[PDB]
């Protein structure tokens with residue numbers, strides 16, 4: 001009967017979880033070897049091991065039907081069994097799965113191997129995105145140079161893989177349907193365990209959108225003063241190559257030309273980092289110190305022994321796009337980052353170490369629970385610390401920000417600088433998955449796939465390509481996550497919930513009081529706070545053992561994803577900016593782009 005079976009099922013799950021952890025270790029090692037060293041041999045190795053694990057998952061999913069798991073008393077056992085039924089791509093027939101793996105490695109390796117010719121020297125053709133092209137996009141204020149690098153990169157990283165992307169969409173759809181989801185959109189959304197999740201995000205985005213429109217309007221106004229009206233129009237979408245980022249996802253790199261008060265300080269600690277002899281090692285050691293200062297877990301020896309924290313100097317191809325890795329044993333966690341000594345990179349280091357901390361916090365959990373409460377939780381951890389590291393308060397403590405006077409004008413500069421990252425990103429992140437969802441769901445005909453991309457970027461972000469594109473081009477895969485098949489909604493969720501975590505951690509630390517002028521949210525530093533660390537420990541140690549509202553509740557007693565906290569952080573900016581835009585008669589909104597020919 002059921003009482004005896006539930007006891008046996010508990011024993012079954014205990015052994016299977018350990019077996020899954022061990023088998024996944026092997027897959028992860030092969031994936032790591034390939035990402036660190038792209039060769040035909042490593043690709044073959046990676047894909048063959050994945051195919052082996054997929055075959056085993058099929059056997060597992062099949063075996064779950066031998067247990068009456070839906071009839072069990074234990075919510076915990078039922079949750080584990082449910083996790084094991086979700087095959088994802090592993091549901092595909094053997095040959096289809098092999099084809100998908102080959103398709104995915106073809107796209108990611110194409111992205112990783114992109115090289116372009118120097119704008120000034122057509123003989124020198126070894127410029128990679130990281131660091132060469134990204135350096136130009138972030139630093140150059142020559143609009144024709146910027147336009148050149150934009151076109152060269154999108155042509156090579158995007159258009160070149162159209163046929164592979166098409167087959168990937170077909171196989172992704174086939175896999176979703178084998179799992180009885182309507183499409184890959186629903187398969188992705190299932191990770192959030194909430195059937196109203198899309199509407200919730202629409203509601204939150206709608207609340208923040210007006211602030212984005214104000215930032216967009218002001219930036220456009222300031223760019224007109226820099227480049228002239230021949231380059232930037234008052235009423236049209238902003239030409240995206242002028243925004244300091246290849247994908248226009250964050251605009252912090254053009255802060256020096258769009259800052260509210262150019263005569264007052266704007267935080268940019270890159271020069272001081274270099275002057276003080278910072279290295280990638282030091283940056284990671286400083287991140288480690290931040291976590292341990294909060295009474296959280298120190299980085300294990302394997303991390304230091306096995307991580308790659310600088311771009312290799314041999315001739316080899318690799319994936320430089322920064323990532324954090326769990327090997328599902330004990331204390332085997334690693335980062336691979338082509339680290340540079342900049343302010344932006346210091347935040348990236350803390351982001352990636354947020355993943356590592358999460359891995360360490362939940363490594364005692366059964367295998368199926370060794371992941372984030374939802375994908376957004378994993379992305380939020382390191383960003384909460386980055387918000388603190390970015391404050392004038394913290395940066396003065398570590399001697400990177402000198403002779404800084406925090407008057408009302410400096411505060412507006414800093415809030416604006418943060419918004420150029422945190423608010424600007426929201427419509428971007430939403431469009432990445434809105435686009436792919438529309439393809440997965442079969443809502444866009446193949447003949448319209450490229451202009452469907454640029455239509456969303458126009459509608460939500462008010463940006464456009466520097467040159468005319470058409471259906472002869474295919475631009476979406478020029479973004480890493482699109483070539484690498486990484487869900488993006490996690491980052492939209494993260495940018496909302498990180499402010500919920502930050503606000504709460506700051507209150508717990510005694511660093512934020514809404515009725516005290518000396519403790520504003522935008523200058524909170526949680527460094528050294530064991531109290532904030534305790535909330536993190538309580539939440540992160542849970543892994544995916546409970547639905548995410550229980551994980552949020554463990555942190556601050558709340559159960560709802562809310563835009564209240566992000567709006568609260570930027571409220572002083574909103575008040576100032578609304579008035580400043582009225583003062584300067586700034587045009588808000590944009591006409592439909594003419595940059596994608598149907």
Ligand SMILES: *[C@@H]1O[C@H](CO)[C@@H](O[C@@H]2O[C@H](CO)[C@@H](O[C@@H]3O[C@H](CO[C@H]4O[C@H](CO)[C@@H](O)[C@H](O)[C@@H]4O)[C@@H](O)[C@H](O[C@H]4O[C@H](CO[C@@H]5O[C@H](CO)[C@@H](O)[C@H](O)[C@@H]5O)[C@@H](O)[C@H](O)[C@@H]4O)[C@@H]3O)[C@H](O)[C@H]2NC(C)=O)[C@H](O)[C@H]1NC(C)=O
Pocket residue numbers: 178179180
């Ligand atoms: C996605 O959705 C799919 C449905 O759209 C779903 O596919 C269905 O899965 C069912 C398995 O759960 C399967 O049901 C079986 O059907 C067999 C006969 O099917 C034939 O005829 C169909 C048309 O009439 C054809 O379409 C098929 O191709 C087949 O030719 C039955 O023989 C079988 O029965 C046995 O199993 C049941 C189940 O027993 C359960 O467990 C315990 C066992 O101890 C029972 O006590 C308990 O009561 C419970 O019922 C037994 O009751 C029975 O005695 C037999 O042993 C079974 O009903 C179905 O065929 C299949 N397709 C369709 C079209 O319905 C996928 O599984 C879903 N995928 C995922 C990942 O969830």
Ligand SMILES: C[C@H](N[C@@H](CCc1ccccc1)C(=O)O)C(=O)N1[C@H](C(=O)O)C[C@H]2CCCC[C@@H]21
Pocket residue numbers: 249321322323324348351352379486491
């Ligand atoms: C650098 C970072 N890299 C990603 C790596 C994600 C990944 C998933 C699966 C296999 C390999 C890599 C991450 O750590 O989440 C990243 O891409 N991004 C995203 C981006 O740069 O597009 C959004 C960024 C928000 C701020 C922190 C960094 C976030």
Ligand SMILES: *[C@@H]1O[C@H](CO)[C@@H](O)[C@H](O)[C@H]1NC(C)=O
Pocket residue numbers: 037039040041042314316
């Ligand atoms: C890269 O992989 C090749 C074989 O694919 C191997 O021989 C070589 O040692 C690796 N290179 C480095 C730098 O690890």
Ligand SMILES: *[C@@H]1O[C@H](CO)[C@@H](O)[C@H](O)[C@H]1NC(C)=O
Pocket residue numbers: 295530537
């Ligand atoms: C550090 O964490 C432990 C449990 O992990 C806790 O018991 C202890 O109180 C914390 N240290 C401080 C100073 O609060």
Ligand SMILES: [Zn+2]
Pocket residue numbers: 351352355378379
């Ligand atoms: Zn991340």
